[PDB]
């Protein structure tokens, strides 16, 4: 019950980058022959990695391309490379895209870099759609939530959703998808940071339960102890990667001509708290009753 | 159905400071002759203010005291003076308190200053209880929520609650009541600040409604649009005074040996946003749909 125009259509996808994320995505698509798959990777040319990578390409039913120019055949090019390589990749692909083709940039970079990738693509004939991957890929494969933005975002979402992928078009302006992903971090990690600051303060003052009561009375819809349990355990376990996500978010907001003091302070806070909790005999299972006394003392 | 020990008891209260807050409190107590009331004020000695202040003392049924030494008669002394005068007041009263008397400091100062007030009182015979007034006094009079902390906090709460006041004992340690008041600000104004940062960012990126959706999905208990309506209108109207409350909260947290980056960033944010919104034709009634585009542009 997806779109007819898109089911009765010749659909070739080329990955740029054939790492884990690209592999799991191509994994879930491969058995269906939902589309002719291909992948360009530099390691396809490295004698030390070539054999092992080409076998896996064969095992997931993806064709290895020897060169970037092998993407000329694709309707949709997916760019999943190391963040640092984003622009370089874009610039390589640009001359080889057909004028109907869409390059979707799925890299973990801010709207600024996305804009430069879009610019490289524009020096050739292809279209650019900006994407942002909303979850880790392994647990979801090809149904990982992706946000897309651009002239052709609705069009590619529909086309790739007809193949079983999980895209939503969030705007016509490239930059909007990574902006949305980054800003969404601000509320979520901002709240986590506020709990860290309020609760460890409260704890040093001996009024923790009373302060949880007072937040519970002010914002009654949520169970704030469940919130503090959940998000402080997130600081415990993934504090390092949560600080990266925050650092990027501050840069995104700054990139819009806005000061980002909440995002910067939250990043600092989550990093300080993660450090504070390491090697203290805590468990992700321990709750705020567990974490807060440690943070109180260690901060 | 309050305590018998406290109803069948000789109960004299002396205010130090006879301003609005002290007047409204003494107002609601005065008609009942719930207690022998008195008040020391410097203006009781100023020919320019004396007549007018003594008439109002008579109208609310409070006795003027010519001197601080007139508090020797009180069981409970209430200190409501300008923040700056807190310690000075405490030091004046200390020699005059009886050894059964309780000095309750109700001034808008942090636990640090409260501790110094407590120290002055300790150089005499009286007891010290630390209080913190939780709302503006005019709309509540004598039933304004007060938090108290100290050895005798339970005792004074019960005694003053037997006279119709609205006290809760929150701890045995002086400093806890103002700590609790201040820290409670962190979550509340932190959230307001996070909405300002997230929403005006989102708005510059054209994804405001989507970001509200994504906060609504993450923290489903609350209606986040009502939250943003409510708290941004608070930034509009009372942004100036909300920044003071935040500045104090950062100092309180700092006073505990903790860095206060969330509190400091929130204070900055609320002040920046309040400034941004002034003289833009906005109304407290306007909601986030109204405020956010203004903040987006003006920040």
From TrEMBL, chains A, B:
This is Phosphogluconate dehydrogenase NAD-binding putative C-terminal domain-containing protein. Pfam families: DUF1932. It comes from the Bacteria. The keyword Oxidoreductase applies. Residues 202-270 form the Phosphogluconate dehydrogenase NAD-binding putative C-terminal domain. Keywords: Oxidoreductase. It comes from Rhizobium meliloti (strain 1021). One of its GO terms (molecular function) is oxidoreductase activity. InterPro entries: 6-PGluconate_DH-like_C_sf, 6PGD_dom2, HIBADH-related, NAD(P)-bd_dom_sf, Pgluconate_DH_NAD-bd_C.
């Amino acid at each position: 019950t997806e779109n007819l125009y898109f089911q009765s259509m010749m659909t070739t996808i080329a990955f740029i980058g054939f790492g884990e994320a690209a592999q799991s995505i191509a994994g879930g698509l491969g058995g269906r022959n939902a589309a002719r798959l291909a992948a360009y990777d530099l390691r396809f040319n490295d004698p030390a990695a070539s054999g092992a990578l080409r076998a896996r390409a064969a095992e997931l039913g993806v064709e290895p391309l020897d060169d970037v120019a092998g993407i000329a055949c694709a309707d949709v090019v997916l760019s999943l490379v190391v963040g640092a390589a984003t622009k370089a990749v874009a610039a390589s692909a640009a001359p080889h895209l057909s004028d109907e083709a869409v390059f979707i940039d799925l890299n973990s970079v801010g709207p600024d870099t996305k804009a430069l990738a879009a610019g490289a693509i524009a020096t050739g004939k292809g279209s650019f759609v900006e994407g942002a991957v909303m979850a880790r890929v392994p647990p979801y494969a090809e149904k990982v939530p992706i946000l897309v933005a651009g002239r052709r975002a609705v069009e590619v979402a529909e086309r790739l959703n007809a193949l079983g992928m999980n895209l939503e078009a969030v705007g016509e302006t490239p930059g909007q998808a990574s902006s949305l992903k980054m800003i969404r971090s601000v509320m979520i990690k901002g709240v986590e940071a506020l709990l860290i600051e309020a609760l460890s303060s409260a704890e040093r003052a001996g009024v923790t339960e009373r302060i949880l009561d007072s937040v519970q009375e002010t914002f009654p819809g949520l169970d704030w102890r469940d919130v503090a349990d959940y998000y402080l355990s997130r600081t415990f376990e993934h504090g390092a990667r949560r600080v990266t996500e925050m650092t990027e978010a501050a840069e995104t907001i700054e990139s819009f001509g806005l000061n980002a003091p909440m995002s910067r302070a939250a990043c600092e806070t989550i990093a300080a708290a993660h450090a504070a909790m390491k090697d203290q005999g805590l468990s992700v299972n321990d709750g705020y009753r567990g974490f807060v006394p440690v943070l109180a003392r260690r901060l």
